[PDB]
Amino acid sequence: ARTTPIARYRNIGISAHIDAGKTTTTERILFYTGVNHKIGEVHDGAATMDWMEQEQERGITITSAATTAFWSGMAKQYEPHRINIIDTPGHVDFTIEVERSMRVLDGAVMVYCAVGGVQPQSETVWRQANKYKVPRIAFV
RNA sequence: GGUUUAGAACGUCGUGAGACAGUUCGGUCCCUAUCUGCCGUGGGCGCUGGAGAACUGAGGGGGGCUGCUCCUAGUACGAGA
Numbered sequence A: 001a002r003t004t005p006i007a008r009y010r011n012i013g014i015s016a017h018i019d020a021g022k023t024t025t026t027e028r029i030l031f032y033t034g035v036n037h038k039i040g041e042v043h044d045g046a047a048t049m050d051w052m053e054q055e056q057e058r059g060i061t062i063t064s065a066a067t068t069a070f071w072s073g074m075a076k077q078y079e080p081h082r083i084n085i086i087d088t089p090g091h092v093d094f095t096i097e098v099e100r101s102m103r104v105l106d107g108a109v110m111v112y113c114a115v116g117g118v119q120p121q122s123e124t125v126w127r128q129a130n131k132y133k134v135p136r137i138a139f140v
Numbered sequence B: 001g002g003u004u005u006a007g008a009a010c011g012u013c014g015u016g017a018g019a020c021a022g023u024u025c026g027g028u029c030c031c032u033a034u035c036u037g038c039c040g041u042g043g044g045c046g047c048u049g050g051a052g053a054a055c056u057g058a059g060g061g062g063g064g065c066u067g068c069u070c071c072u073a074g075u076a077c078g079a080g081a
């Protein structure tokens, strides 16, 4: 039947202030689980999370697009888990994408910058996370 | 090439020879550099015995132009662009 027991699923959300590195960390995760070669960047648009061609050119993630992989914690790189990341955007203009995403995840790794710490958009998505008690960790 | 010479015409003016910041076609542009000047290149003499070399360097001339891309760097700035 199903390929994996439920305890191997981790539905996590990546969300933060603009440019805090959500898409970069998502592409790094995809590479480190091996569904992506060529780690790639965003300012050169070659990243694969970005398709709509606006975020290709303008280099700003505008809408969430879920993605899956197989990374593992028990004897890591082995005994695969199912991490469903959702690369959400952090723009106040697109906070609606965070809203519906934050309401649909069971956890979410918040991203913070080490230069500015929290930022107004992060203080916003913090309300959008307390709004649903979405469990969460921070990634500086 | 044009402007303004001789040929020619149109429009216009003049009765006319002709004329017009009106137009059109055609229409010869000379000079062996003496001096000054400047580019170079020498011959004489000096420089205090003659000669051969190497120099120092007064002083003068040449050369001084820049773009793009990459890195720094998606950094600082900016809520974001």
Ligand SMILES: Nc1nc2c(ncn2[C@@H]2O[C@H](COP(=O)(O)OP(=O)(O)O)[C@@H](O)[C@H]2O)c(=O)[nH]1
Binding pocket: A017, A018, A019, A020, A021, A022, A023, A024, A025, A041, A042, A043, A059, A060, A061, B074
């Ligand atoms: N120095 C540094 N720059 C980063 C990091 N993550 C992202 N960036 C830069 O941030 C710019 C855009 O990153 P992006 O993926 O758009 O961040 P996001 O907008 O939050 O997803 C790019 O030029 C990256 O070079 C990081 O961990 N360190």
